[PDB]
Design a protein around this ligand. Sequence first.
Ligand SMILES: [Mg+2]
Ligand SMILES: [Zn+2]
Lengths: 515, 139, 417
Amino acid sequence: MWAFQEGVCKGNLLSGPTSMKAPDSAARESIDRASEIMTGKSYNAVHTGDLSKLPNQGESPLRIVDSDLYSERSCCWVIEKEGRVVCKSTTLTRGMTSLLNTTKCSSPSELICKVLTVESLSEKIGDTSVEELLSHGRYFKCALRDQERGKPKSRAIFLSHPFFRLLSSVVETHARSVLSKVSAVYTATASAEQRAMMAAQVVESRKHVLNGDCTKYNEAIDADTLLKVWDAIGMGSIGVMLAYMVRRKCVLIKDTLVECPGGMLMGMFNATATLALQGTTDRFLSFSDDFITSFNSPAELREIEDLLFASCHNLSLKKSYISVASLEINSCTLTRDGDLATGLGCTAGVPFRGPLVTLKQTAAMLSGAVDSGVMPFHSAERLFQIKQQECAYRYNNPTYTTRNEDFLPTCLGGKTVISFQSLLTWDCHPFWYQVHPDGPDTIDQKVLSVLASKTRRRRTRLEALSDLDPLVPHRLLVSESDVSKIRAARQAHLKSLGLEQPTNFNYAIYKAVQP
Amino acid sequence: MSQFGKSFKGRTEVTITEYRSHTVKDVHRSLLTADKSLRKSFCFRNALNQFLDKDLPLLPIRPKLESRVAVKKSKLRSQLSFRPGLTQEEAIDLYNKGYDGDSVSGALQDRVVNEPVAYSSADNDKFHRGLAALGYTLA
Amino acid sequence: MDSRFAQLTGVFCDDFTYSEGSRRFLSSYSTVERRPGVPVEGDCYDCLKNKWIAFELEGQPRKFPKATVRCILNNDATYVCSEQEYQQICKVQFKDYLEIDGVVKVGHKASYDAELRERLLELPHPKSGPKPRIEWVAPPRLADISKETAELKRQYGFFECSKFLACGEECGLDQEARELILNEYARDREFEFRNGGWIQRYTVASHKPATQKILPLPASAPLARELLMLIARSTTQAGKVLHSDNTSILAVPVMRDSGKHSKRRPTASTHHLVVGLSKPGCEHDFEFDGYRAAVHVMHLDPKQSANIGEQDFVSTREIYKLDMLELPPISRKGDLDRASGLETRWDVILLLECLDSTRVSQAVAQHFNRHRLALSVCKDEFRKGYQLASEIRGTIPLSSLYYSLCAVRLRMTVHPF
RNA sequence: AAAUUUUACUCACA
RNA sequence: GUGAGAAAGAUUUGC
Ligand SMILES: [Mg+2]
Ligand SMILES: [Zn+2]
């Protein structure tokens, strides 16, 4: 059906591929490709362009944001049981906590400052030295990236050591800052459509547009290129340490460690590679492995190809193409004048995951489509009604609900089929506020979040410290007694107020109800 | 022995960020194993029962949107709307009234939202989420 | 105690008074304000609170007693400390950004930089690759797509029946007949019965791929939504026949046979065999008590079943139909047939896209979008993007790929661009 | 048996 | 069904 669309369509209405296949095959294939590129027989991994144009940021203070350093996502923690290396799959929060415990440091910033100011690699930092940290940070674990549309064979992603993440955070923050300084398109607060519009504005002068993608992007970005870029932007010893760790990286496939001296292991340094391309020229607008350029004559095309080769951005002959009336960047397709190309485009369907999450996500998707002009409002109204009917058919049974209140949705035993316009205008029962894209979280979302918090990798017996005073910074050091006092005082105040738990706060509702 | 000395072995003080990250239960991930999780132990049914009788009769009634203007289809553009965060005194008051501290802190930060919009009005005014085609204005 | 914070403490307290006239904070770096004859536990002393205050940078603790109040000067133009007043007073007082020597910078050169650089030098380096030759030609025409489709047809052929696609059409059986047929089929196959549910026991695996061919398209798929909902429900709860308004299916957990201590309950990694009923007239026929039906089985891992069952058939069809061109009639093999073809077979194709967990149709759709938007493509390389047989494995994915290519061919034939 | 290295673990307690 | 241990358990699967 996607083939018989008047406009453009990527066939995104269904979910991406998935399976329970082990990640051994994909990781092995990626490592083999990296080795082949290293031998210099398949693609180019040697950087030749000049990066002197990039500004130097060596005098900037060393800043670390703890928000991205602690997360519920997976990571690899290395321990030495008796005399061998054991790689354990934990959460990034747990890995960072273990790293700080072994190094005996209050915060990651203290750890990085101590690491950068030791006399020798053998000097001790708590229970470990810099040499041990570098040895442990080169170990990676493999996993499968499923649900990636257009890739029937799922790719291999890699979980890294906490120290590797700690250094990569600084490197990528500074690389992103340098990118934002290089051009106005890489601004932090910019959407995909805004980037596409700027791209259209940039290539209006020329006639032909080359929409290009890079093949084996991660396997062709050597540690040498990363070190070159980092030195160009002035990363000091952090860049050297990261390059050394990347060059000696080992991947644990099943139960064996495989050495992968080439590549950068599936997009660890997207900003750094984007800089590797952008510092050699200004004729490209690239985002990692996807770019668009413009030209008038075959000589300009040859120059573009030479520039791409020099920057280790190997053109994908399978996907890259040339157009005259189209512009594809960040998956977004625009006409040469900057207007959105007619058709479904990147519109993605909403799978059935929760009676109310499905409705909320459908509302968000329909709002996005209607605002952009993809479809008219009445079509969105009809689609929302149909989705409500389908949710009722799928979830209206004793397993999920036992209520019959009229105001409830038909999928929760009710008899209300809310209009899309009525929902978007907040002209409905308060129970429907959670279904609004800007409204509170739904019941299913909270239930799933709690259940996830109860998972094996994330379960903890620590006394939860939630509902804190806004005036207390999150960098403040606390002990067990301190957290006990804070919780006791907050619980006493709440009991005085008569509330057993804090009342959920929504910014939109609070701002609307205000006079 | 307390959990503090085991999770943070060798350290007597840790940042609030780390402690909070160790106990996080407010992040939602859309995953394949959603219907099975909701069915298990009738968790969603129990949560709906609890919400309908303890949490629902606390949400304030939000007035519906009224203002709208004539709009016409136009070239795609980016609408930037700056939603400011709560003031210090406002946050202190809301905390004192028993509102969840985490949500107030999150709302403390000023933020800007960029959305693609393909409709324009005569006076070039902003529109609400998803209502640009109908002309509802932020005002 | 350090001399680098002398200026920092001086500007911290200029004219701040605690009771009526006396300065609240006294700098320890100035003898006039310093208290003689007492130990110094910090760079400032608060008479009102009677405590010591020590200033330190991010990640550089100083040697002071724990009782001393510590103020952290963050590098992002913000400050952190214990007392609210100190945090607020520091923020307003230090509104002017003054650099304090001793702050580590990103470009800091460690004492081991030379050693690490030498070690990197001694490590292997890549070799320059060959310069590719690129020739830009027109995108492939109808002949190339026809050639790819014919290659697939010759290589794999066709099955005699649509195995599980036929389950999209109602069988001529009622609820009780369907349940009886499914239960007796389970009994015939020697499935173990336990706790009122059916389990399939396996011991040895041939460890070779199952035969792959192309499924012919049934006439229509009226029971697509019901089939997907039933698949979801059954793979969520298995062992017993689950019924819909017009059809029913049986999800059987597949478990290893280990003797006495063999597994009794399925886990999150246990696969399922989904058994469905369709009209008789194929090699998979089954009869019992005068009831005849074709029984077809699909082996799915839990993720595959979850992916299949969560798709929305009706919404997807409507969204596609919003801005779709006229769909031509097609035959059982996907070939254009304006005489005996049926336009409902397209729905079947959509159902196939829902039943294929590899979603190769999405890859074909992306490549076709590139084809339609392209003016010139690389020679002998853009065509290879349509050869995805090596990427997938199985009957359902193969059929989905074949019919996606057939849809591309039909679009190029009926509505050329 | 099938979309075929996948459909598999141990202990304590209830 | 809960806890702990296997390079490991379903928020799995990273930037
Ligand atoms: Mg591209
Ligand atoms: Zn058959």
